[PDB]
Ligand binder design. Structure first.
Ligand SMILES: Nc1ncnc2c1ncn2[C@@H]1O[C@H](COP(=O)(O)OP(=O)(O)OP(=O)(O)O)[C@@H](O)[C@H]1O
Ligand SMILES: Nc1ncnc2c1ncn2[C@@H]1O[C@H](COP(=O)(O)OP(=O)(O)O)[C@@H](O)[C@H]1O
Lengths: 149, 180, 658, 320
């Protein structure tokens, strides 16, 4: 029963390490022209999410993984949700920065495209509100706990 | 044992010259040993020979000699074969433990090592001409146990113990100079 | 005539200096000194018209025993006073200097002493790194000077009125060139010295230096890390050749050192001059015997002799009374550990042991060889507190007991002990015990590297730490790892072991910064930002813990780097001299002299015999029906006679390895 | 009586063990002495005559600790197998065993009050235990390395602990933690003492302290290093005033006499030396055995001392 005990201890350590990583994971902030806080380390966050997802998927194939099946399923669901949210948010930050750079240096762009300028201003206000909310709660779990995020 | 651990790199002529030198001088040292040594038949048996021949492996003196070298290794070997069927053999045999892969540009090094040796698996690397630096401490197979948690010095993360672990390495270029 | 000599051969070797002097004597009409067996350079032009040798100007000082091995003020010798005088002559005209010569000659120490003996010139010691920038000089000018405005223009002057601020350049040649064969910092220096000023970055306004000078010193450009200096810069700077001090200078300086050393024991004051003569002739014969052609680490400098003096004084300080036999035993031990430990060949080691025996018998008469010393000369502070010699048997027993303790403590791997591994362990221990002594263990793969060092680091209280490298390994991440290492060493006051292999030296992008770390402790341009602010607040918190008030930025940084250079220990491990693939190829002689080299070599025949006998003793292979051959082929000269079956088997295994 | 220092040579020698000794303890009820061995065994012998009585084995790993109760009706033990065995000296048999540790336990003993038992192991975790229930109720951590030795003071509201991270922390046993830090040592710490019985007057008079109403300013304890030196912390910030030098190897332990007037220490130099701290010099140096000494313990009421060695030999010195 020594091998079974070692496998159970390894699975418990896996769950504890995953929970500790989820609790200690935080969203880095970088100043952007004194307007908002763009997320820093997006590549590192994506790599960490991919590594956690791959580790969970590969660990859900062993013979002694049925002891913490519910915890493994919950961790996999949380990791998938966090990965999807980060994948959406990285594109959101990139597109918002592109739109802000496009519409910031141009003064007659509002006159040329008024509806597009108004839509961009509304999207920029929404992005600023989201950035303020993310800065208020920099924790990854706190950010993911916002309804409708 | 001297042949197994020493004459794994030399060609047939130098290998036999070394064996004859060892045998002649050990005879000069007055130690009892057989003269008509058949080391290949002595180190294996007919059932495993037929198993090897049924499997994808050639059949002559040097190839069966290196085959009996592969069976009872202690350090994980570096096979230099134009065919390259050791990966096929290891996926045929040790598929029961969900073998994983690691190379140079894998985005996870410490996380990959800790997860792999955490839930338990063997390892195998492809394109072995560019060597894998992950393989150094597990290649050593050193032990540092903390009371049920076996850990070795690679990465900031911690690992566990996996009983089933075989490493088979490959080299296509017959003229390379490995690091010392 | 004197200035023509010092201008046309002032950077030339001694034999070519003599050739130029005799050529000047041949073509000249000015009267010259009439002594034939002396060069003209050894004479001096005094205020009076007649010549007078420099030998009548040198003193013979006696320094305290408190400062006998680290003479921040140098011993005034002929070369010291001569180069002091010429530094004064070339410094009073604000021209920049460069002192060139082989490492170990004393250029930087004589430069410090001569440039600090006068109160007019203030000193700002600065070291040039490979990635140095003119922004470093701009920061130095901001700290030590100020921007004042006159109707003529902007003027940069020192804060201290009436003081000529001299900026120091410890390595004027070390900054790397660009892709177009120029060095930006030395072009900046040339611009200052040729225009009398520069242009400010913020205001784009011309400025004018008021009381600023420059002084540099470097190694020859034939060194691997040194570049041919630009002719446009070299047009200004005179060059002085600082050769090795030579036999008269060595005898004078180290006779003074021995006279100030041997004051602790009062009954051996008569042996100071024989000790000086013996050491100087051993040093010069070893230098003549061994050169750089066989191996590139065969450099011999008076830094070896100063380390010798420091070791002798460290051994003699705790001991109340010693005999002449014990004194020359400590002398022989230090000679071994400073000279023959770095040799590669067993023939060379035998030659050096015979050299030590010959030196002892020639220059130490009426002293018995056996009572003077033995063959196993081993010193350790483990078995006893005092630094007294320990014998092989009790040393091996104590190390075996400590190793049995170490098995279940950190690493559970069997080890076999013998003479060479005991010698290597004691050498490693003495290098860790000596502060700032950086160890460099090289040899064949295996052979106990990163195992004896780990064992000694565990037993001496040092915390071992290995280094790993990866792909996409940013200099920022390497600086973060060095941040944790430096914080542990200095801020937390925890000793660390800088264990690394040659496989971690795959990229030279971080090789230069560990070179500067080995040179002067700290590496410039590393930590800047909010992490810099947090580490200085951590440093001042550690200052409060250790009991000093340091709220000042640069003094806190200086205390941090002083703590680090106090408690940082370095051990290198790499293969013998066949690795020309890396950037160094031949590694820097300055790095070799700063470090200390231990040659592990391969396991000897007796080493293989013992490590085979210990491991094979578990099985039962004894044959009572064994027949002893009338002629046994034996390679181990200390085999038992008649050999047993186990002895024959392990001799066969040793022969198989051979 | 009060000046009955140990003197050479030993009046009795025992060689009935098969491994090195770890700890030496006694009993308050009867004149029976017990010890620990590295082969899961305990040796019991008499001092008046020098005859062994029985042995108390049963552990799975090497025993590295032993404790004695003030009432004399309780005992404690520890082993590297993460097990603590409590036995009764009346029947010389085991009573209960409590697990809970995760690494090799270095030392374990019961508190002076007897309500809770401290623990120490390579995992740097102190685990408490119950007597009637046998279940853990309290725990502590914070050490950066393996815990060497921990012992509460006379008051029982403070405990001195040292580790291998060159830092010894003194914390309140009752509720608080991290009262002061003593990191002046440069080597690893091995052992430390808490307080003697008649030590306050000695500290107030001989050392640099106030007279009469000193107010008991903190714990004044020596040792705490292995680089042939000792460090002493007085109060608050832990100023260093007294250093004990003379050990040829790493220190092993420190104790006091019955009257608290003599200082006796043991180390790995294979010699037991008693030095008078008032004279700041060694009073008598004696060779314990031919092997390294691991532990020693001097009897308080009886005028004798004991010593251990790794050569399976135990010597009992005579004090007069
Ligand atoms: N006249 C002298 N008096 C005292 N010490 C001397 C004298 N000449 C040489 N030395 C010693 O010889 C050594 C000279 O080494 P070296 O000049 O290379 O070192 P440095 O002055 O520290 O700097 P650098 O390596 O940059 O030259 C020093 O340790 C110095 O103490
Ligand atoms: N003196 C010795 N006696 C017995 N074994 C040794 C000795 N020195 C080294 N070894 C063995 O060599 C092994 C590997 O260490 P080594 O190869 O020397 O490190 P490195 O590869 O850094 O040189 C260790 O497991 C150790 O057991």
């Amino acid at each position: 029963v020594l091998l079974v005990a070692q496998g159970e201890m390894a699975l418990e350590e896996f769950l504890k390490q995953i929970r500790e990583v989820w609790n200690t994971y935080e969203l880095d902030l970088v100043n952007y022209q004194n307007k908002c806080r763009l997320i820093r380390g997006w590549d590192d966050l994506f790599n960490k999410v991919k590594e956690h997802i791959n580790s969970v998927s590969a660990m859900k194939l062993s013979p002694y993984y049925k002891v913490f099946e519910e915890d493994a399923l919950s961790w996999e669901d949380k990791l998938n949700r966090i990965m999807a949210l980060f994948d959406v948010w990285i594109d959101v930050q990139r597109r918002w920065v592109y739109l802000e750079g496009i519409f910031t240096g141009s003064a007659d762009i509002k006159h040329l495209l008024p509806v597009e300028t108004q839509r961009f201003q509304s999207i920029s206000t929404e992005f600023l509100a989201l950035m303020k909310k993310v800065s208020k709660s920099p924790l990854v779990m706190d950010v993911l706990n916002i309804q409708g995020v | 044992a001297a042949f197994i651990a020493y004459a794994g790199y030399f060609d047939q002529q130098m290998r036999q010259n070394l064996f004859t030198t060892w045998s002649h001088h050990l005879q000069q040292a007055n130690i009892q040993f057989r003269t008509d040594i058949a080391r290949t038949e002595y180190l294996s048996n007919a059932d495993e020979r037929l198993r090897w021949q049924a499997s994808s492996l050639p059949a002559d003196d040097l190839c069966t000699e290196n085959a009996i070298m592969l069976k009872r290794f202690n350090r994980y070997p570096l096979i230099i074969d134009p065919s390259g069927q050791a990966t096929e053999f290891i996926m045929n045999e040790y598929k029961d433990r969900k073998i994983t892969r690691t190379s140079f540009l894998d985005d996870a090094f410490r996380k990959n090592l800790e997860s792999a040796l955490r839930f338990g698996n063997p390892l195998l690397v492809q394109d072995v001409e560019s060597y894998d630096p992950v393989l150094n401490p597990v290649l050593n197979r050193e032990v540092r146990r903390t009371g049920g948690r076996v850990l070795i010095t690679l990465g900031d993360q911690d690992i566990d113990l996996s009983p089933s672990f075989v490493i088979f390495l490959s080299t296509r270029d017959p003229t390379v100079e490995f690091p010392p | 005539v004197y200035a023509i000599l010092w201008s046309l051969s002032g950077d030339s070797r001694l034999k070519m200096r003599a050739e130029l002097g005799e050529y000047i004597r041949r073509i000249t009409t000015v009267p010259l000194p009439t002594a034939p067996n002396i060069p003209i350079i050894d004479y001096e032009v005094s205020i009076s018209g007649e010549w007078s040798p420099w030998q009548a100007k040198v003193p013979q000082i006696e320094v305290e025993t408190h400062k006998v091995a680290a003479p921040d003020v140098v011993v005034p010798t002929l070369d010291t006073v001569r180069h002091e005088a010429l530094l004064y002559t070339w410094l009073a005209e604000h021209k920049p200097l460069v002192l060139c010569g082989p490492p170990g000659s004393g250029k930087t120490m004589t430069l410090f002493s001569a440039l600090r003996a006068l109160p007019d010139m203030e000193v700002v010691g600065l070291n040039f790194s490979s990635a140095t920038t003119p922004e470093l000089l701009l920061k130095t000018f901001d700290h030590y000077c100020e921007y004042r405005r006159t109707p003529n223009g902007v003027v940069l002057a020192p804060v201290q009125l009436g003081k000529w601020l001299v900026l120091f350049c410890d390595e004027i040649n070390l900054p790397d060139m660009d892709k177009y064969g120029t060095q930006r910092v030395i072009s900046f220096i040339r611009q200052m010295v040729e225009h009398g000023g520069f242009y400010r970055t913020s205001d784009q306004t011309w400025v004018k230096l008021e009381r600023i000078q420059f002084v540099g010193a470097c190694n020859p450009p034939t060194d691997p890390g040194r570049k041919p200096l630009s002719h446009r810069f070299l047009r200004h700077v005179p060059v002085v050749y600082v050769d090795y001090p030579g036999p008269a200078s060595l005898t004078q300086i180290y006779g003074t050192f021995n006279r100030a050393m041997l004051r602790l024991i009062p009954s051996l004051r008569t042996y100071a001059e024989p000790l000086t003569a013996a050491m100087v002739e051993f040093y010069t014969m070893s230098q003549e015997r061994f050169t750089q052609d066989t191996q590139p680490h065969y450099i011999y400098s008076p830094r070896e002799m100063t380390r010798w003096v420091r070791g002798i004084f460290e051994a003699l300080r705790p001991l109340e009374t010693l005999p002449v036999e014990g004194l020359i035993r400590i002398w022989a031990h230090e000679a071994l550990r400073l000279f023959q430990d770095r040799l590669v060949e067993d023939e060379e080691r035998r030659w050096t042991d015979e050299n030590i025996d010959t030196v002892a018998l020639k220059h130490f008469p009426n002293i018995d060889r056996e009572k003077a010393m033995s063959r196993p000369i081993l010193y350790s502070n483990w078995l006893s507190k005092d630094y007294i010699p320990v014998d092989q048997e009790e040393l091996r027993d104590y190390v075996k007991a400590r190793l049995k303790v170490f098995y279940e403590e950190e690493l559970d791997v069997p080890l076999v002990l013998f003479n060479e591994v005991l010698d290597h362990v004691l050498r490693i221990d003495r290098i860790f015990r000596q502060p700032q002594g950086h160890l460099l263990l090289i040899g064949v793969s295996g052979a106990g590297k990163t195992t004896l060092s780990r064992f000694v680091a565990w037993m001496n209280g040092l915390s071992v730490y290995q280094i790993k490298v990866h792909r996409k390994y940013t200099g920022e991440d390497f600086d973060e790892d060095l941040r944790t290492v430096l914080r542990r060493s200095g801020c937390k006051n925890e000793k660390i072991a800088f264990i690394m292999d040659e496989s971690n030296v795959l990229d030279s992008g971080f090789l230069e910064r560990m070179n500067t770390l080995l040179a002067n402790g700290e590496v410039p341009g590393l930590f800047e930002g909010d992490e810099y602010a947090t580490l200085m607040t951590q440093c001042k918190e550690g200052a409060q813990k250790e009991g000093l008030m340091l709220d000042s930025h640069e003094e806190l940084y200086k205390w941090f780097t002083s703590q680090v250079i106090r408690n940082l220990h370095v051990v290198f491990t790499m293969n013998p001299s066949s690795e020309g693939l890396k950037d160094r190829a031949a590694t820097s002689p300055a790095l070799f002299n700063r470090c200390v080299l231990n040659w592990f070599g391969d396991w000897s025949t007796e080493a293989l015999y013992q490590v085979g006998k210990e491991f094979t003793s578990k099985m039962d292979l004894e044959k009572p029906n064994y027949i002893v051959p009338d002629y046994m082929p034996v390679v181990y000269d200390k085999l038992p006679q008649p050999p047993s079956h186990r002895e024959a088997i392990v001799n066969s295994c040793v022969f198989v390895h051979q | 009586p009060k000046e009955w220092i140990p003197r050479p040579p030993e009046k009795y020698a025992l060689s009935g063990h098969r491994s090195p000794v770890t700890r030496v303890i006694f009993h308050p009820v009867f004149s029976v002495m017990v010890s620990a061995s590295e082969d899961a065994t305990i040796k019991v012998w008499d001092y008046e005559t020098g005859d062994f009585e029985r042995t108390l084995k049963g552990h799975t790993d090497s025993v590295q600790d032993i404790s004695f109760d003030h009432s004399g009706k309780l005992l404690a033990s520890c082993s590297a197998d993460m097990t603590i065995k409590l036995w009764d000296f009346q029947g010389f048999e085991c009573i209960r065993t409590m697990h809970g540790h995760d690494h090799n336990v270095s030392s374990v003993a019961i508190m002076p009050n007897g309500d809770h038992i401290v623990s120490a192991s390579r995992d740097k975790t102190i685990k408490m235990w119950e007597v009637q229930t046998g279940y853990c109720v309290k725990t502590f951590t914070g050490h950066r390395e393996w815990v060497r030795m921990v012992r509460p003071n006379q008051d029982g509201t403070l405990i001195a602990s040292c580790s291998n991270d060159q830092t010894v922390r003194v914390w309140v046993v009752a509720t608080k933690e991290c009262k002061a830090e003593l990191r002046e040592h440069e080597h690893v710490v091995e052992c430390i003492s808490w307080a003697p019985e008649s030590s306050y007057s000695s500290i107030s008079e001989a050392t640099g302290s106030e007279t009469k109403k000193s107010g008991k300013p903190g714990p004044f304890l020596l040792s705490g290093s292995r680089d042939k030196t000792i460090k002493m912390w007085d109060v608050s910030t832990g100023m260093c005033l007294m250093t004990l030098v003379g050990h040829d190897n790493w220190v092993r332990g420190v104790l006091f006499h019955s009257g608290g007037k003599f200082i006796l220490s043991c180390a790995d130099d294979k010699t037991l030396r008693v030095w008078d701290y008032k004279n700041k010099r060694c009073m008598k140096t004696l060779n314990a055995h031919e092997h390294f000494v691991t532990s020693l313990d001097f009897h308080k009421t009886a005028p004798y001392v004991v010593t251990g060695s790794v050569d399976q030999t135990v010597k009992v010195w005579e004090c007069r």
